[PDB]
Amino acid sequence: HWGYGKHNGPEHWHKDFPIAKGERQSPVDIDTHTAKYDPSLKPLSVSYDQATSLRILNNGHSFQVTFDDSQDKAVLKGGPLDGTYRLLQFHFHWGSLDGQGSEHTVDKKKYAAELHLVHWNTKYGDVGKAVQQPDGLAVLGIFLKVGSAKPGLQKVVDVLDSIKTEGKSADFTNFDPRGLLPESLDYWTYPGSLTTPPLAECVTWIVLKEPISVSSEQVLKFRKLNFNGEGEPEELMVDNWRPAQPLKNRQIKASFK
Ligand SMILES: NS(=O)(=O)c1cccc(NC(=O)NCCCCO)c1
Ligand SMILES: NS(=O)(=O)c1cccc(NC(=O)NCCCCO)c1
Ligand SMILES: [Zn+2]
């Protein structure tokens, strides 16, 4: 199957997912001197008060926390978005070294990791329908920088021992994703895609200006996860990021000056 190694990684994906070479692929480099401030962009509305987390799981390419999206509990609205998008899951991408790991870059700078909070457009009824639409998903991307610890991440970090290998999952109820946000909601936005197969061109990307700070010990625990399943040769889950893709006929807009 696909992965992030030399024999199944991003340079190979197009052979099974030809949209990998499409017109609105993600991630991209955000050139801060080419992004345009758009004073028409509304502030984001992050309404996570009623979020209901369910499980945390190792799916062989990241770890993911899932949420009950059977009704408008945790939603993302405003910003560039029309209508209401429900939080479905979040997951991360990270590096083997602190100078790499993020998918988006800022002026070619790579961050140690990147958080993706994945939301789907309720007008399409279910997520499978949404992924077929150019405005079906909104992913809120947040950079992780190595510095002080992020207290709202520690509960995630402390359970990763229990989902070391692909296919493992654990209960992860009563987790508050608001603890993963930075102070500012200033953002860049552009139309793009999923950054993993199937690479569907269905995502409004909203990337926050302000990174969150996580400690070295927190990101070390990401790097102890495994791509493999139990009983298989161990392969550390590191460098699960796609590099920046051609911007092509797109403009990145900024909500701030
Ligand atoms: N899904 S994909 O990235 O297009 C892809 C393309 C080519 C091979 C793979 N999987 C592979 O196993 N490639 C190398 C073979 C190692 C066999 O044990 C996935
Ligand atoms: N990395 S991302 O653009 O935020 C994103 C968001 C939502 C879905 C995906 N891609 C996938 O879930 N691919 C399915 C992989 C099958 C095993 O879990 C990527
Ligand atoms: Zn992602």
Curated annotation (Swiss-Prot):
It catalyses: hydrogencarbonate + H(+) = CO2 + H2O; urea = cyanamide + H2O. Pfam families: Carb_anhydrase. Keywords: Acetylation, Cell membrane, Cytoplasm, Disease variant, Lyase, Membrane, Metal-binding, Osteopetrosis, Phosphoprotein, Zinc. GO terms for molecular function: arylesterase activity; carbonate dehydratase activity; cyanamide hydratase activity; zinc ion binding. One of its GO terms (cellular component) is cytosol. It comes from the Eukaryota. Its EC number is 4.2.1.1, 4.2.1.69. Its main location: cytoplasm. It is found in: Cytoplasm; Cell membrane. Changing G141R: In OPTB3; complete loss of activity. It is linked to Osteopetrosis, autosomal recessive 3: A rare genetic disease characterized by abnormally dense bone, due to defective resorption of immature bone. Osteopetrosis occurs in two forms: a severe autosomal recessive form occurring in utero, infancy, or childhood, and a benign autosomal dominant form occurring in adolescence or adulthood. Recessive osteopetrosis commonly manifests in early infancy with macrocephaly, feeding difficulties, evolving blindness and deafness, bone marrow failure, severe anemia, and hepatosplenomegaly. This is Carbonic anhydrase 2. It comes from Homo sapiens.
